Write a protein that binds this ligand. Structure first.
Ligand code: HEM
Length: 154
């Protein structure tokens, strides 16, 4: 499954705007994920007690987590599909330490697309959203193959 260089440029041009303030984008993506699919918050032992969007917004630890997640995903997207080294540690921790099913990776993908669609209409028109969806589908397909190698059905 393979993206064209033009699709990768549409992915990297919206990611450049995310990088103006990766912490703010991470907060919005995690609030969207937890609001839309509340069951995903139960996987975070440090954050599952948060009850409202205001508590989520005020959590310094959740802000730091959002920066970690988006910076790891950004490094994966900048490899333009050559991300085997980056996916190894991530697949292992998400399969075995955190136990994150592929369905929850689909939910965070949905949250990312929703937040980029809302914040970045200048760089997230239909063709760019289609390229980001392809990049995230590639990421989830390769993560799912690694999960199977690691012994996790998820
Ligand atoms: C775009 C997909 C994702 C990326 C790039 C990502 C990235 C990361 C990174 C870099 C870390 C820190 C190091 C590690 O333990 O691997 C992390 C931790 C974690 N991830 Fe993810 N993650 C993703 C999706 C998810 C989803 C969807 C969930 C749950 C629904 C999840 C649950 C967790 C948890 C529970 C931790 C430990 C958090 C803590 O220390 O409090 N991840 N993730």
């Amino acid at each position: 499954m393979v993206l064209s260089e033009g699709e990768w440029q549409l992915v990297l041009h919206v990611w450049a705007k995310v990088e103006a303030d990766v912490a703010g984008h991470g907060q919005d993506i995690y609030i969207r994920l937890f609001k839309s699919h509340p069951e995903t918050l139960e996987k975070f032992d440090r954050f599952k007690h948060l009850k409202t969007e205001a508590e989520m917004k005020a959590s310094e630890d959740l802000k730091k987590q959002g920066v970690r997640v988006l910076t790891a995903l950004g490094a994966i997207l900048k490899k333009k599909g050559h991300h085997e080294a980056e996916l190894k540690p991530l697949a292992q921790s998400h399969a075995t330490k955190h136990k994150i099913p592929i369905k929850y990776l689909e939910f965070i993908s949905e949250a990312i697309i929703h937040v980029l669609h809302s914040r970045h209409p200048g760089n997230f028109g239909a063709d760019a959203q289609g390229a980001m969806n392809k990049a995230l589908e590639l990421f989830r397909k390769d993560i799912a193959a690694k999960y199977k190698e690691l012994g996790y059905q998820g």
